[PDB]
């Protein structure tokens, strides 16, 4: 039988939008746990629901998108408050709110009065990034993420104020009940999404178990730390009302390596480009090099997205490898052995944070960015001091393994 | 400005559907090249357009989906003819055709007469897999792939016959011109998609250059070889009218390793499960182990999809590693050295082909399958002879590297 579906039912049934709709093994799943005034990034060796993490992610990247959008403007985003308590998830930013105004074409379609936040939250393929510029470094592009959050919410509340009015709209039952909004005068300016996911439909206990709750809190806490490193310097990231410590890639590196390699040496670099638009967006990099690292490992926040695959990583890997091979054959008086990238890089843990204009993704989840490798070969340069430091640490480890 | 988009314009502008819409560096890009009656899988070190390869892939996986759907039936798919010539791309299968019948709800929506092939090819989120069963091993799930092919076609022709009628419909200008279909009597039974992509819009020369043409032909030829290993035994896969040789994972392994390691030993296993539905779908595996392999490498055809990431790989990796560590500490009289998965597996090239029921993906592209790791720990077993052979080859290589 041949069936025609709408966005709503499709997004509830299909994994192409946010990942699997039940618990699966997520490789590299991490969370932040507090051990006596110390943040540690630890693995979560338990299956979780990718789509569940995506609905947090979509709203968080919407907030960091607003922050970049306003950072060179008069009214800026000074904070991103994220909270997670008793299952309820909330995110609030303070730049200009979403325009409290009637959407003409959306109302013509709906045959009733529809305002912009209702389009932004309930209309698939809708937003301000349908026509993205080549220089735009927002993560958002599809006009889909927010509605993915709504469709996986038992209940949700969009609140937004623009300095003259406040606008409150309830969106319930997986986008099936869209209450008419309530518009009052207010002089506040902010955007807040507040929602309860459908934890049971997504494979979780109702309410969340002790372990599920702790795992999800740790994961969200981690995402907030990542924002705090990516976001600009006038913006505080809060999670459950505490500010997020990690405003630098060095802080992120220390967090991820607190256990494998405490008290270790952090190689740092700011990778710059010479031609606009790339020269507008330096990449911050911190790397630790340890013999007790078993494989190569990276953490990337690119355009606010915690993506796990992309040619920026390969750019750093290949550059470091070429230098490592040169100095290994120099330092070794054996002069015959041939090492490759796995030997070069398996003792490296690296953090890369920043914006890259003009990238594309392999799906809505934005797990993998898509780019020509030559973008980096043409435009970017890794500072030689960082390369030298790194090569030195790595060749030390190689020579001692063959010692 | 807040914009509302339709499927058509969205799919032309957005990379979430099929990948990047221009040329990017695709890691692991391979193609099949003929060298004097020998097929070799060689890297393509040139940027290509992921969405362009996806429109070939979508139709090819639709065909292998039909093949699985009909394999236990009376009228089977006996062939999948694929061709690529002068830019035109074509794919034809011979099971029962697409129902030549009026679609009621689609006609009610369109306010005119719409037949099932027009829904199948022009209506997003539409198909026979909107409600997939947990045991279904077709790649198709979203009701999207075929329309992605149409939207990236300057012109296309859907032809399908059901044994009493033939149905010809033209779909042109990136799904903007949908000509009314032409229905005649015929006693043939088949489905054919024939189309010209928008190579210029996707970053290519018009017409294709010598290198682009050769790269794309090699890549499609490779995909067909993969089908020929995945498809059932009554089904011939043709590419440009020649049959595709590689009906076994051993043939695939030899093709991929013809240069790095000719005349090499191929470890083979059929990984079975004991509980339905998994016991209905054995995984075929072929692996080569060579000192001149620089990193771990796999080729996977799962449910007809050439996916590149999934916990099936990790299942094999971890099992082989546990055995390799045991026998390494046994064979070594050093008895202290500790090796991990990278040491265990960096000399392995492995092919895994077959069906897995109940999997999910991370996006439409289906680059990565999503599953609980325990599915394999509970249900599947790797034959011990294969594990033993593999461990032996690997420990030989490790002992000679430390020799
Ligand atoms: N916190 C926010 N502050 C301001 N505007 C917002 C905020 N969240 C969402 N928006 C607006 O709502 C629109 C719709 O959001 P969304 O559905 O996530 O699409 P998107 O972020 O543009 N692209 P994508 O996330 O890739 O689907 C966005 O384009 C923004 O214009
Ligand atoms: N070669 C074919 N033979 C028979 N039926 C086909 C063939 N190609 C397509 N169809 C039918 O057309 C429908 C629509 O195709 P498609 O748009 O690719 O969706 P899908 O394959 O079901 N799921 P997806 O590919 O993940 O978007 C399919 O569900 C099939 O029922
Ligand atoms: Mg968004
Ligand atoms: Mg399909």
Author numbering:
A (entry chain A), B (entry chain A): 3 to 405
Sentences from the paper on this structure:
One intriguing example is the African swine fever virus, which stands as the sole mammalian-infecting virus encoding a type II topoisomerase. The ORF P1192R encodes a functional Topo II (pP1192R) which is highly conserved across diverse ASFV isolates. Prior extensive structural and biochemical studies have elucidated key aspects of Topo II catalytic mechanisms. These structures have unveiled the inherent architecture of Topo II, which is characterized by two principal heart-shaped functional domains: the ATPase domain, responsible for ATP hydrolysis to fuel the molecular machinery, and the central domain, which interacts with the DNA duplex and contains a catalytic tyrosine residue that cleaves the DNA duplex. As a result, Topo II not only relaxes DNA supercoiling but also disentangles knots and catenates potentially detrimental to cellular function if left unresolved.
The ATPase domain of pP1192R (1-434) was expressed in E. coli BL21(DE3). Owing to the modest resolution of the ATPase domain in the cryo-EM density map, truncated pP1192R ATPase domain (1-434) with either AMPPNP or ADP was crystallized. The crystal structures of the ATPase domain complexed with AMPPNP and ADP yielded high resolutions of 2.3 Å and 2.6 Å, respectively. Both structures contain a protomer within the crystallographic asymmetric unit and these high-resolution crystal structures were employed in the cryo-EM structure construction. The AMPPNP in the structure of ATPase domain partially acts as an inhibitor of pP1192R but lacks specificity.
